[model samples]
Target chain A: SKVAVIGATGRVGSTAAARLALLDCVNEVTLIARPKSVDKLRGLRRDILHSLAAAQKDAEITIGCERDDYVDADVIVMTAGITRLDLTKDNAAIIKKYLEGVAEENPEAIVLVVTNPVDVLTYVALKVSGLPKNRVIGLGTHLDSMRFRVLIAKHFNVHMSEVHTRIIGEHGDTMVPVISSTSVGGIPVDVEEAVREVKEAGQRIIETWGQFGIAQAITNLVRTILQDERRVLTVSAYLDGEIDGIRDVCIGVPARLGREGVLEIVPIELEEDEMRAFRRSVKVVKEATREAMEAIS
Target chain B: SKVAVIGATGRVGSTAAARLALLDCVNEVTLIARPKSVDKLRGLRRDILHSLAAAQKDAEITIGCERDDYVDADVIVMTAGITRLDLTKDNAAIIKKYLEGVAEENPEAIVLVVTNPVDVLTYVALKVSGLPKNRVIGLGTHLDSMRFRVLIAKHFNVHMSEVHTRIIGEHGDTMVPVISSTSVGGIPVTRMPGWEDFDVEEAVREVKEAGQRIIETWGGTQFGIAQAITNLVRTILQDERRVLTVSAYLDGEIDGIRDVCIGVPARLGREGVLEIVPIELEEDEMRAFRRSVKVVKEATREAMEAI
Candidate 1:
């Protein structure tokens, strides 16, 4: 299987690409960038080859610079977006430009967006690309879920993997951390402190997380999809009135991810306040996505 | 369960540790190194954490320097020897030096060696650690087996992973590639069209030369070696009983090749190696293997004398 990384010259995309290359099923990582940024891809391909040269894998790294370049790619990663906020409109323009090529060139490919304001871009790709909603996903608050899980694990002196916490909704402040759903070792937790840490640590995590969080998060998603592990994790998927009466918006919600991307958005129970927060987050996302679309016009 | 990787700061060890950390069965990878090299482990630890911070796995990376560092480990991976170098004597010394502590402090842990002259080092770990021979194994020609299989797969236009080929005997120059077991998709390669014209000797030579060839060109062994070892680790940790060709001791098993650790198809699980499975071998393959093990036995004897 070939996994192509767009924004291949960027830190997060390259890191994720290196990880993806190590996968047994992945025979090649096609590094694709826009022509202006394509120069470094040759060097990137060489270095990945050297790593593969030492490693037993025969996975090849090939360089690419456009729509026609990734026709055979099974998975496409767009790491080209801003994390914090109109920058969303710029990214939407970028997404629309490239995503238009997907239907014509790589219609079978599952598109994963790590571009910021991921929820908005995810929805934008969902609308503009004419792909099934399930095949288009955003990195979402899974990043937040991971960050909050780590906080809870540290607070409770348990392993982060053992901490089951979901931060669903917007990737921004309006996101909801489900306290009633939080647990450690299948036992429910106080969760309030972990929620506060995630809420307080806030955008600082996004700034600090670039080097470590985004790449691994991307790698894990790719790994799950390739292996068809079908693990339920929070992902930003287009909602059709799925929860809290939220509709026609893409927000971070518990979803099963595997070969075809989001198989089902699992219904999660939210407290009254959590539901209120989630609804508010959905409105925020829908508004931004609307702005992104308007920017496209 | 926990796994300890010695020479943990080396390229081979670092790569293995990173892969090992992602294992669901492995809760921790204890990184062990000499005192001088231990400082960099902190940096290595940090990098791995960042990797883990994004990845879904929960495995921890722990730092260590001495025998006391990994006492309860379920397995110990020794990558602490020279590869593509004339350092068998040094390797023997290194293997014996650390292995004795397995008996003293970590008796139950299976010791897996990636040290070059691996069959000899595998034997050394067995004797020095006072562990059961089944508990001490070497990476051996499992690497060679994979290398040869890939060549044959490409030669026959079959998928590499779909080929069933086993390379046996020494981890040395005389390693045997069993033409008998060579098959793809339930059909023998020999039974396939135009099998008579295949240059198997050249293929074997290429497989043998690949280690040094890779080192001289791209650098040292890490990915392939890590995969081979990780396969063994998976079998042991998951107790899968996957019969992989690896270096294990022989006591009247397969032509009564006694008291020597050499590459053979062995069922590996929680107790390290469970059984050496006998397989069909051509007369030429059997003869070549006898020759192969003789060299391995000589080295093990030399390693014994030096230790």
Candidate 2:
């Protein structure tokens, strides 16, 4: 499959591009960057091209500056946005431009947004692209949920593969851990401490190692999507009356993913406290998204 | 399976430890370092432990300052050797000491050596551990062959997976590329459409200097080699019996080499080197292979005497 990586100079975008090029299934990769950043993108291409040569995969790669360059991309990854907490207004503008270009060129392409304030940006892409809700996905609490599973496994002293949990709502501070439905090997355990750790995991890593975990998380997500694994993951999806009382806004929830993007949003029975937390988290994203839309308009 | 990394404080060793711990097949990882380096090892353990929790794979990690701690390991990777060309005697002593410890503790463990002068140290481990030859192997021309494949693919503008070639001999300058068997898409590489313009000598030199280039640029050549070692371990643990070029004890497989470990194509499985594939080489390539055998044999003799 031919994959186009926007913001190919950034850490998350470049890593996903290089890794996708290495996969046996990927036939070509188009690395899209602004004209000024083409040199930086070239260096990344050189490094990954060398690595790909060693693995003996023949995936082709091209560097392009124009939006038309990605017209043929089957999968377009959006990772081009400022990651600061207060920059959603500016980031949404960036997301809108790319989404508009994709709408005109490759409306059927699967769009994955890896920008920060991802839920807000994913909502922006869906509205701007005018594609079906399933086509645009934000890398929501997937990484957060991964952190949740890891902390739970450590607490229970079990293998990470055995722990199953979900982190929904906002991708940041207000993310709600679905603790009521979380379990290890079919046995539900209290996750009060795990909930706290999962919330702080990204901040702690950023303090020591800047943006280290997101690359691996993006790689896993792209692999699942391209391979059409249909694996259920916690990602930001537009809720159309599925969460009982929420709609029109993108938020983190358990959803099945495949080549078609969001396949199904898995429903859960949340306890009263969990539902309340979920609603609060949803409100936080809704307000920010609303503010972003107003400022951008 | 439980794996132990002997040089857990080093670049290649630590990376392998972390990546292995992330794999679902691995149940435990024991990170072994010198007593003085336990603090550094502990930091690596913490970082990987956090990543493991995120992946939700429950692979336990432990730090060890004692050789006796590896008694229960199913597989032990020896990555504790200097990369400098002149340290063979000293490196050999180090390998001997570790192999002796493994013999006393985990005798049946499959030992994979990633130390430089790998063929020589692998010979040292085989003789010192008194283990069957199949149970001991080295990360020999495996990485070298990977480099060769990469260069050829770039030359032909083909995907790396399309190129099939092997580099066999010493892991260093004298390694011989089996040009006679190299092919792409079941067709001989020489017969391919763009074969006439390819620079064979330049590619060979590039393969030889790859490690030096990586070290100069990155201060260490660990990630590629570490990933290569992980792939090897996965193949062996899964009993996949994949055929790849690695350093194995030569016992009448090659025309003139015997009782010494050198790079050759071997089938790897749960029991380790299952069989060595004997490919017919060109006369020139065979001569080069014989010369590498002599060099490795001399180094092995020196290492044995040093121990």
Candidate 3:
């Protein structure tokens, strides 16, 4: 499979692109970034080339500068957006505008959204492109679920396999921990006790390290897909009006996945509090998505 | 970590030993087989050395026929056992008696049971050595799961990811297919008339062909286990408890096969078979599992008499 990172010069984007380049499945990789960021991409590519020079002895480093220059890609990860630190309404507006260019250029490719306020901007891109819901998915909830599972496992002093939990709804603070069905070693867990500990764990991670947790989850998701491993993982998927009659919002849920992308959402029985929290989380997400939509307009 | 294959001259044992020798995680590999099999292993090692010699290399084929030697091994794959053609109740007993030596010598090593009637022998070894249940697991459901999932994806004309399914129960003909929970492109295959048309016997036949199919084409299926064993080794060395369908001792989960090892998907890593995924089965699926357990039990009982 040919993979291309549109904002390959960016921090997370470049790392992901470089990692994919080294993988055997990806036959070729394209590192595309803004004009000013061209030098950075060149430098990174040179470093990679130098490292691989012995193995791929005759490989040449290609360089060019035309937005219309299309690179054929089966999987297109969109990290081309303003950083969280440079979060301006105008910058967000510009990012929204670029969706048209991306959709037109890579219509058939799986579009993975990596922009901040990801839950909102992902929907914006989805609406603008009119792509199938399955093809255009926000990179949300996946990281949150990983953190919830990992933290829960740590709290209970058990292996990660024992932790069966999912962080649904928003990717941010309002994320709902599906505590009712929470389990350890296939044994039902105490939701009231687990949630309090896990939430604090998430907060502590954010406070200590900025993006390590999210980065780790993203890497795991990518590995699962790349290896065509049919593993049940939590990832943001377009809600088809499943929970509390919510609709037209994407949130994190347990999804069966393989190379083609999100395969299916595992249906689980949620408690009354979970249902209420899920609805509230959707509303919060809708508000942010609306604000992002209005700014772009 | 160092890996030592006890039956390294046989089809499965030799492949496991050679593959581990090449793995990045494995620091060293020791290949040991029976008295007669020792010469065969030496010939195979000579072949490998000659091939390397053609490339102007002189790497030593480090192996010996130390029938009584004991070494500290990180992983020990038990591939030494009588062939099916030579298998009788007595042969099984003889092999089980011989493997007690393996369990005694490599007490802490991750014991991978690749011998036939593995599920029963796993329990026997665990009982003999008193090792933790997790450490003594057989190479069971992993190959069967791979075949089942690969076939399902093939039928749907979708990537392996699109097939929402898991293979559980025993590795033999009685392996249960949880088709009810299966889906394609997020669509549950309830009324897929084609699947409903088939009977349980056909599915059983598919599982039965697991070993023979590879043997028909490749003369033997050491490569599949080669790929599988290497992945298992990597998981342990890296401490990645990846959920995999492998043969492991049952702890009162299946109907009547408690304390006996059988193939089922579970987490595999440094600690060996970790967690067994408790996939709920239907009435018919449960019946199929019982038959598989019965076959393994009977076959193993017969094999034990020879030792």
Candidate 4:
């Protein structure tokens, strides 16, 4: 399949584009960055194409502006967005403009929003594009879930795949770890002990390294989805009242994803205390979504 | 560290030995195939080293061989094996003579055997030189395990890394899949209803097919093992115990493995294999292990008789 990567020259985009080129199944990969970013992408495009030529031989690389360059894309990954420290009003306008461009160019393509406040931007992309709710998704819970799993695996000295946990609710500090269902090697984690450690650990990481952890997770998710391996994943999807009392907001949830988009939402059984944390997380994400909406108007 | 792969002109040895020349970490790779295979290696040696020279004009390709050919090597991969399907017994003897020469010449170097019935021949090498078991190991379990895990992942539609499984017993049909401990995404697979259909015999069949499949496609199998051997060499040179499955001495604790060399998950590093991870298996798997050991023992006896 041919994949057109928007913002292909950016840190995440270039690596994703290069990795996609390496896949034996993929036919072509196009780099869609802003016109000004074309020069930088040319060298990268050549390097990736050269590697692909050596490895797969039949692969091709293309580069152009979003409107002029991306002709046909099976998957449209939007990583083009401003990074701001303050959760200010102006960010919505910046995000909406790019979302509209992506929506217009490829309405049917799986729209993956990697912009800040992804929970809101994913909803905005769905609204603006009018595509199926499953098609427009924010690269959400995958990154947060990976962060949760990576830490657990390292701490326990187990295989990274052995950690079955998820970060629900907001993609921020308000994100809830559904510790009730958390287990390693079929053994459930004690909820009380896990909650204390999980909360403290999340806070320490957010405080220490800032945002790179989330970015790394998002990059990994893009790779997973692009490969279309139908992996059971956790990513932000627009809520169609999946959670009771929560509607029209994008929140993290366990999902089974394939080529087109999210194939299914796995409604995991949450304990009473865990359900309360989920509600709190929904509130934070909802507020953020509302704030984004008000700013756009 | 410089690595000299004997039989560097052959399929498995040549590619790995040549690729070693390109590795950033490796200083040099020496080709040590037979007299007839020398030309095949020289062409590859010239192309690769000249490319290296063209890229970096100061580089040089050191080439030659004699009685004094055995130079200072951190590791010497023994890929010089015969592949006469009709004369399997006679071929085994011919290869043994070459192995004895390698043991005498490069006694201290880490000796890695990539030959068929590798477990049996590895024991023969150990007995011949009285070399430490750790230094003398056969490349067995690593590729076999990759095959097993890959097939399971393909069937389950999960990433290969997600399948927490290991291959034990033999590198052949009697190979044991430690099913009791196998899990997917931290979920113990034995509890999953899908585990009922998962067969260890099918897994062993698939691993064995890895050799025949490649040979069917390319006339002979070599590249994969060459890559694997190169990986093994780097692990030892860098002292990285990369947790590879290889053939080594096993104690008769679980199933049938007793004072015999067979395929098992071994930690390969600078000091050679540091330890073996004991894998948990089911009752049927235990029986299969015994059968595998018996097969290896019988094969060893046959190869010994041929010699």
Best by lDDT: 2
* DockQ values of all predictions: 0.13, 0.20, 0.09, 0.16
Per-residue lDDT of model 1, residues B16-99, tens digit only:
787788778888899988887755676566556546756646777899988888767899999986532337779988987777
lDDT of 2 by residue, B25-141 (tens): 777899998788776776666566655654445677898967677757888898987634359887877777777756666667889988878999999888887778888999999
Task: Provide the lDDT at A264 for model 3.
Answer: 59
Q: State the lDDT of candidate 3 residue by residue for A147-214, as single tens digits.
A: 66776778777777656656777777788876564555443455555556555665576587634444
Candidate 4 lDDT, A78-183, residue by residue in tens: 6666423244345456555555555555666777777667777777667766678888777765565565676777777866544687677767667777665455
Candidate 3 structure quality by residue, lDDT tens digits, B1-307: 7676777787776776666656557666667766666678788777655655565543344565453432456776667666552554433454455445555566676777677656666666665555678887777766666566567666544567545555665666666666654554333444232445445346547767868777797777788777777777778767787666677777775564574567766777788876776656678877777777777766555444444
The true-versus-predicted C-alpha distance at residue A201 of model 3, in Å, is 7.5
**lDDT tens per residue, model 4, B1-307:** 7677766767887677766666666787777766666677679788777767765633234444432453356676667666433344755664565555554666666777776667777676655545577887888666777677777777666667666666775666677766664555544554333456777566667687777777888877666676778778878888875566688877653454567778876767787877765655567776777788888888777676766
Please provide, for model 1 over A1-297, each residue's C-alpha lDDT reduced to its tens digit, 9 standing for 90 to 100.
889988877767766777788778788799888786654675556445434433445575788887777756888888865343458778888888877647565667898888888899998888887777788888878777777776666677776667787889888778888888989988987556656656655344333322335677888888889889999978889887657556788889999899988888888887899888887888888888888888897
Candidate 3 docking quality: incorrect, acceptable, medium or high:
incorrect
Q: What is the C-alpha lDDT of each candidate?
A: 0.78, 0.79, 0.64, 0.67
Error of 3 at A61 (Å): 7.1
Which prediction has more favorable TM-score, 2 or 3? 2
Error of 4 at A173 (Å): 8.0
Q: Candidate 3's error at B221, in angstroms?
A: 5.0
Task: Report the CAPRI category for model 4.
Answer: incorrect
Query: How high is the lDDT of residue A241 in model 2?
Result: 81
TM agreement with the true structure for every prediction: 0.69, 0.79, 0.69, 0.70
